[PDB]
Design a protein around this ligand. Structure first.
Ligand SMILES: C[S@+](CC[C@H](N)C(=O)[O-])C[C@H]1O[C@@H](n2cnc3c(N)ncnc32)[C@H](O)[C@@H]1O
Ligand SMILES: C[S@+](CC[C@H](N)C(=O)[O-])C[C@H]1O[C@@H](n2cnc3c(N)ncnc32)[C@H](O)[C@@H]1O
Lengths: 214, 213
């Protein structure tokens, strides 16, 4: 069970971090981006695209050049304000808490970068049900995230794994968030059991890219 | 790091002793030939000190390479298991390694999968004791788990919980220390304590180190 207090802490961390977010971005994402981009540019991101947890809009920029229309959901109005600065004409932002979310449309593709590791085990399944209902017939879900090597989990052998890590902002405020590293095989297996077909690959050391078809 | 976690960890290994070999260190069997090429580089010779010898898996190798082995472990149960190997040149002694100041020196000190059980607040004192046990010209070598260099910053955790919970067949459950350290991280920390170190990932998830006092 992941406490609701961890989940609120994570969203406030990002709320408060939003204005200094780009000063640090996601560690080493800038090293892994061309490798991830080879997958993102493979052609499945097109038509009407949904982006979840769009943050300050780094991925939203790429999604915007590939798609006709982008709908981009983030839990933080602050993040949405920062992303607004990129002036992307074909993008609508909506504030939305992703742990309390029932889509009412469908899109040709759904994309998220570094969101899934902030979804704890006990919410993973309801989150993936809503994504499933968000994807149109013929569409895919793609995402980027951190990964670990397949054997690490057994090397550690922890029956009660630490879901959380603690971060610190420029001004010294301290917040715990969810950070679950999942291997490509562990993700593939779990999503396969929820009815998805998945191609999940480490495309650069420490990063994976996934394509999942409902 | 509470005294309680230290004690819990030693109790875990004391109880696991009889069934340790049934499971061994996860994937060490995959890495062992890569670790053995370093173990046979020639530095393990003469009078050798092994720490946390456990059921004697590495002791057998050191026994074949050295003239004499002194092997230390906190668990009398582990020592009795290692006795079944019948190693003629090895002396076992029971020793709590968090309260240990050697009285003599050896040509080489070795341990496998011990350092990850030493939490950051006991690190320095453990290395002070090790340093005083190495003779002039000797080295310390060790094998352990590791991570790629970037994982720590990807995770970016201010207050790393170092504890993990293990549960034995019979249902008894224990907390132990399990700190993964990359080669660079270990290199920087030991250099700062005066050691000069060659630490390498020799098989994915495993490192081997050679350290000179
Ligand atoms: C771990 S993701 C960081 C990735 C960043 N969007 C990027 O795409 O480069 C952090 C984003 O998740 C958002 N977030 C955190 N909790 C949320 C929640 N419960 N619902 C929706 N968004 C959430 C934060 O607002 C932030 O934009
Ligand atoms: C992390 S090592 C496990 C693998 C084993 N070292 C091997 O050589 O393959 C566990 C060994 O360290 C020992 N140990 C745990 N705490 C100790 C302590 N405080 N002092 C000495 N030995 C300790 C246990 O008895 C056990 O044999």
């Amino acid at each position: 069970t992941t406490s609701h207090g961890l989940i609120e802490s994570q969203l406030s961390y990002y709320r408060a971090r939003a204005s200094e977010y780009d000063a640090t971005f996601v560690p080493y994402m800038d090293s892994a981006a061309p490798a991830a981009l080879e997958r993102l540019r493979a052609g499945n991101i097109r038509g009407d695209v949904l982006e979840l947890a769009s943050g300050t809009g780094y991925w939203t920029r790429h999604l915007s050049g590939l798609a006709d229309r982008v709908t981009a959901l983030d839990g933080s109005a602050e993040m949405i304000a920062e992303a607004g600065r990129h002036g992307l004409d074909n993008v609508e932002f909506r504030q939305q808490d992703l742990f309390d979310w029932t889509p009412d449309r469908q899109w040709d593709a759904v994309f998220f970068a570094h969101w899934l590791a902030h979804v704890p085990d006990d919410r993973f399944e309801a989150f993936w049900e809503s994504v499933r209902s968000a994807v149109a017939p013929g569409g895919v879900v793609e995402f980027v995230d951190v990964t670990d090597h397949e054997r690490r989990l057994e090397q550690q052998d922890d029956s009660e794994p630490e879901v959380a890590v603690r971060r610190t902002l420029q001004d010294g405020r301290s917040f715990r968030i969810v950070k679950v590293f999942r291997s490509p095989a562990e993700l593939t297996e779990r999503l396969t059991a929820l009815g998805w077909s998945c191609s999940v690959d480490e495309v650069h050391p420490g990063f994976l890219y996934a394509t999942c078809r409902p």
